[PDB]
């Protein structure tokens, strides 16, 4: 019941979005053409 | 306490999602290969 509340889902989504954004910036920085 | 509320987390997630979508739309168009 704790892991499926709105607050925890929002927090986990925010953390994963932050990590995904950082990784996507790192990937776009890595380019050869 | 302000930085960990639901409203601020939703706003930051929305902004980062918008930025990620804008970046991925131009990563996809990088189709020289």
With 0-12 / 13-18 / 19 or more C-beta atoms within 10 angstroms meaning exposed / middle / buried, residue A10 is middle
Nearest residue, CB atoms, A18 vs list B16, B23, B24 = B16
B1 touches chain A (CB under 8 A): no
Give the determination technique. cryo-EM
C-beta atoms of B10 and A10 within 8 A = yes
Q: How far is CA B31 from the centre of its chain?
A: 22
The dihedral through the CA atoms of B12, B4, B2, A5 has a sign that is positive
Of the residues A8, A22, A24, the best mutation for testing chain B's interface (the one with the most B CB atoms within 10 Å of its CB) is: A24
């Amino acid at each position: 019941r704790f892991n499926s509340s709105n607050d925890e889902r929002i927090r986990v989504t925010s953390e994963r979005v932050e990590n995904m954004s950082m990784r996507l910036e790192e990937v776009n920085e890595r380019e050869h053409s």
